[PDB]
Coordinates of all heavy atoms in Angstrom, one line a residue:
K1 N -30.6 22.5 1.5 CA -31.8 21.8 2.1 C -32.3 22.3 3.3 O -33.5 22.5 3.6 CB -31.5 20.3 2.3 CG -31.8 19.4 1.1 CD -30.7 18.4 0.9 CE -31.2 17.3 -0.2 NZ -30.1 16.6 -0.7
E2 N -31.4 22.9 4.2 CA -31.8 23.6 5.5 C -32.5 24.8 5.2 O -33.6 25.1 5.8 CB -30.6 23.8 6.3 CG -30.8 23.1 7.8 CD -29.6 23.4 8.6 OE1 -28.5 23.5 8.1 OE2 -29.8 23.5 9.9
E3 N -32.2 25.6 4.2 CA -32.8 26.8 3.8 C -34.3 26.4 3.4 O -35.2 27.2 3.6 CB -32.1 27.5 2.7 CG -31.4 28.7 3.1 CD -31.4 29.8 1.9 OE1 -32.5 30.0 1.4 OE2 -30.3 30.2 1.5
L4 N -34.5 25.4 2.6 CA -35.8 24.9 2.2 C -36.7 24.6 3.4 O -37.9 25.0 3.4 CB -35.8 23.8 1.3 CG -35.9 24.1 -0.3 CD1 -35.8 22.8 -1.0 CD2 -37.2 24.7 -0.5
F5 N -36.2 23.9 4.4 CA -36.9 23.6 5.6 C -37.3 25.0 6.3 O -38.5 25.0 6.6 CB -36.0 22.8 6.6 CG -36.7 22.4 7.9 CD1 -37.4 21.1 7.8 CD2 -36.7 23.1 9.0 CE1 -38.0 20.7 9.0 CE2 -37.3 22.6 10.2 CZ -37.9 21.5 10.2
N6 N -36.5 25.9 6.3 CA -36.9 27.2 7.0 C -37.9 28.0 6.1 O -38.8 28.7 6.8 CB -35.7 28.1 7.3 CG -34.9 27.7 8.6 OD1 -35.7 27.5 9.8 ND2 -33.7 27.3 8.6
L7 N -37.7 28.0 4.8 CA -38.6 28.8 4.0 C -40.1 28.1 4.2 O -41.0 28.8 4.3 CB -38.2 28.6 2.6 CG -37.2 29.6 2.0 CD1 -37.1 29.4 0.5 CD2 -37.5 31.1 2.4
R8 N -40.2 26.8 4.2 CA -41.4 26.0 4.3 C -42.0 26.3 5.5 O -43.3 26.3 5.6 CB -41.2 24.5 4.1 CG -41.8 23.8 3.0 CD -41.9 22.3 3.1 NE -40.5 21.7 3.0 CZ -39.9 21.1 4.0 NH1 -40.3 21.1 5.1 NH2 -38.6 20.6 3.7
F9 N -41.3 26.6 6.7 CA -41.9 26.9 7.8 C -42.3 28.4 7.9 O -43.4 28.8 8.6 CB -41.0 26.6 9.1 CG -41.2 25.2 9.6 CD1 -41.1 24.2 8.8 CD2 -41.5 25.0 10.8 CE1 -41.3 22.9 9.3 CE2 -41.6 23.8 11.5 CZ -41.4 22.7 10.7
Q10 N -41.7 29.2 7.1 CA -42.2 30.7 7.1 C -43.5 30.7 6.3 O -44.5 31.3 6.8 CB -41.1 31.5 6.3 CG -40.1 32.1 7.2 CD -39.1 32.8 6.5 OE1 -38.1 32.3 6.0 NE2 -39.1 34.2 6.3
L11 N -43.6 30.1 5.1 CA -44.9 30.2 4.3 C -46.0 29.7 5.0 O -47.1 30.2 4.7 CB -44.6 29.3 3.0 CG -45.2 29.9 1.7 CD1 -45.9 28.6 0.9 CD2 -46.3 30.9 1.9
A12 N -46.0 28.9 6.0 CA -47.2 28.4 6.8 C -47.7 29.3 7.8 O -48.9 29.3 8.1 CB -46.9 27.0 7.3
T13 N -46.9 30.0 8.5 CA -47.2 30.8 9.7 C -47.4 32.3 9.4 O -47.6 33.1 10.3 CB -46.2 30.7 10.8 OG1 -45.0 31.3 10.3 CG2 -45.8 29.2 11.1
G14 N -47.5 32.7 8.1 CA -47.7 34.0 7.7 C -46.6 34.9 7.7 O -46.6 36.1 8.4
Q15 N -45.5 34.6 7.0 CA -44.4 35.3 6.7 C -43.9 35.2 5.3 O -44.7 34.8 4.4 CB -43.3 35.0 7.7 CG -43.7 35.2 9.1 CD -42.9 34.3 10.2 OE1 -41.7 34.1 10.0 NE2 -43.6 33.6 11.0
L16 N -42.7 35.4 5.0 CA -42.1 35.1 3.6 C -42.8 36.2 2.6 O -43.7 35.7 1.9 CB -42.3 33.7 3.2 CG -41.2 33.0 2.3 CD1 -41.9 32.2 1.4 CD2 -40.4 34.2 1.7
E17 N -42.4 37.3 2.6 CA -42.8 38.3 1.6 C -42.4 37.8 0.2 O -43.2 37.8 -0.7 CB -42.0 39.6 1.9 CG -43.0 40.8 2.0 CD -42.8 42.0 1.1 OE1 -42.1 41.7 0.2 OE2 -43.3 43.1 1.3
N18 N -41.1 37.2 0.0 CA -40.6 37.0 -1.3 C -40.8 35.5 -1.6 O -39.9 34.7 -1.3 CB -39.2 37.4 -1.3 CG -38.6 37.2 -2.7 OD1 -39.3 37.0 -3.7 ND2 -37.3 37.4 -2.8
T19 N -42.0 35.1 -2.1 CA -42.2 33.6 -2.3 C -41.5 33.0 -3.5 O -41.6 31.9 -3.8 CB -43.8 33.5 -2.5 OG1 -44.1 33.9 -3.8 CG2 -44.5 34.2 -1.5
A20 N -40.8 33.9 -4.3 CA -40.0 33.3 -5.5 C -38.8 32.6 -5.2 O -38.1 32.0 -5.8 CB -39.8 34.3 -6.5
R21 N -38.4 32.6 -3.8 CA -37.2 32.0 -3.4 C -37.3 30.6 -3.3 O -36.2 29.9 -3.2 CB -36.5 32.7 -2.2 CG -35.2 32.3 -1.9 CD -34.5 33.6 -1.1 NE -34.4 34.7 -1.9 CZ -34.1 36.0 -1.5 NH1 -34.0 36.1 -0.3 NH2 -34.2 37.0 -2.4
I22 N -38.5 30.0 -3.1 CA -38.5 28.5 -3.0 C -38.2 27.7 -4.3 O -37.4 26.8 -4.2 CB -40.0 28.2 -2.5 CG1 -40.4 29.0 -1.2 CG2 -40.1 26.6 -2.4 CD1 -41.8 29.3 -1.2
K23 N -38.6 28.3 -5.4 CA -38.2 27.7 -6.7 C -36.7 27.8 -6.9 O -36.0 26.9 -7.3 CB -39.0 28.4 -7.8 CG -39.0 27.7 -9.0 CD -40.0 28.2 -10.0 CE -40.5 27.2 -11.1 NZ -41.7 27.6 -11.7
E24 N -36.1 29.0 -6.6 CA -34.7 29.2 -6.8 C -33.9 28.1 -6.0 O -32.8 27.7 -6.6 CB -34.3 30.6 -6.4 CG -35.1 31.8 -7.0 CD -34.7 33.0 -6.4 OE1 -33.8 33.1 -5.4 OE2 -35.2 34.0 -6.8
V25 N -34.2 27.7 -4.9 CA -33.5 26.9 -4.2 C -33.6 25.4 -4.7 O -32.6 24.7 -4.8 CB -33.8 26.9 -2.7 CG1 -33.1 25.9 -1.8 CG2 -33.5 28.3 -2.0
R26 N -34.7 25.1 -5.0 CA -35.0 23.8 -5.7 C -34.1 23.8 -6.9 O -33.4 22.6 -7.1 CB -36.4 23.7 -6.2 CG -37.5 23.3 -5.0 CD -38.9 23.7 -5.8 NE -40.0 23.2 -5.0 CZ -41.1 23.7 -5.1 NH1 -41.5 24.6 -5.9 NH2 -42.2 23.1 -4.2
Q27 N -34.0 24.8 -7.7 CA -33.2 24.6 -8.9 C -31.7 24.7 -8.7 O -30.9 24.0 -9.4 CB -33.6 25.8 -9.8 CG -34.9 25.5 -10.5 CD -35.3 26.5 -11.5 OE1 -34.5 26.9 -12.3 NE2 -36.5 27.0 -11.4
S28 N -31.3 25.3 -7.6 CA -29.7 25.3 -7.2 C -29.4 23.9 -6.7 O -28.2 23.3 -7.0 CB -29.5 26.3 -6.2 OG -30.5 26.5 -5.3
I29 N -30.4 23.2 -6.0 CA -30.1 21.8 -5.7 C -30.0 20.9 -6.9 O -29.1 20.0 -6.9 CB -31.2 21.3 -4.7 CG1 -31.1 22.1 -3.4 CG2 -30.9 19.8 -4.4 CD1 -32.0 21.6 -2.4
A30 N -30.9 21.1 -7.8 CA -30.9 20.4 -9.0 C -29.6 20.5 -9.7 O -29.1 19.5 -10.3 CB -32.2 20.8 -9.9
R31 N -29.0 21.7 -9.8 CA -27.9 22.0 -10.4 C -26.6 21.2 -9.8 O -25.9 20.7 -10.5 CB -27.6 23.5 -10.6 CG -28.3 24.1 -11.7 CD -28.3 25.7 -11.5 NE -29.5 26.1 -12.3 CZ -29.9 27.4 -12.1 NH1 -29.5 28.1 -10.9 NH2 -31.0 27.7 -12.7
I32 N -26.5 21.3 -8.4 CA -25.4 20.6 -7.8 C -25.5 19.2 -8.1 O -24.5 18.5 -8.3 CB -25.4 20.9 -6.3 CG1 -25.4 22.4 -6.0 CG2 -24.3 20.4 -5.6 CD1 -25.2 22.9 -4.6

C-alpha cells in the first residue's frame, strides 16, 4: 500500500518511466 502511494505521487509530477508497475501492485494486494 505504501508503494502504491509513492507510485501515485511519481505519475503526477512527471516521473515513473515504468507505468506497468501500478497494475502489478494492485494485483499482489488482491492475492494477499
Side-chain angles (χ1 to χ4, degrees):
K1 262 144 173 162
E2 236 180 325
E3 258 212 52
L4 258 176
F5 188 89
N6 277 305
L7 280 188
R8 240 195 291 113
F9 271 53
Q10 274 175 275
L11 216 220
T13 69
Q15 301 157 43
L16 215 221
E17 239 235 15
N18 187 9
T19 75
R21 193 151 295 166
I22 302 146
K23 195 166 206 169
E24 301 173 2
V25 174
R26 287 169 172 155
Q27 285 181 48
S28 35
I29 299 190
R31 277 165 206 157
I32 305 189

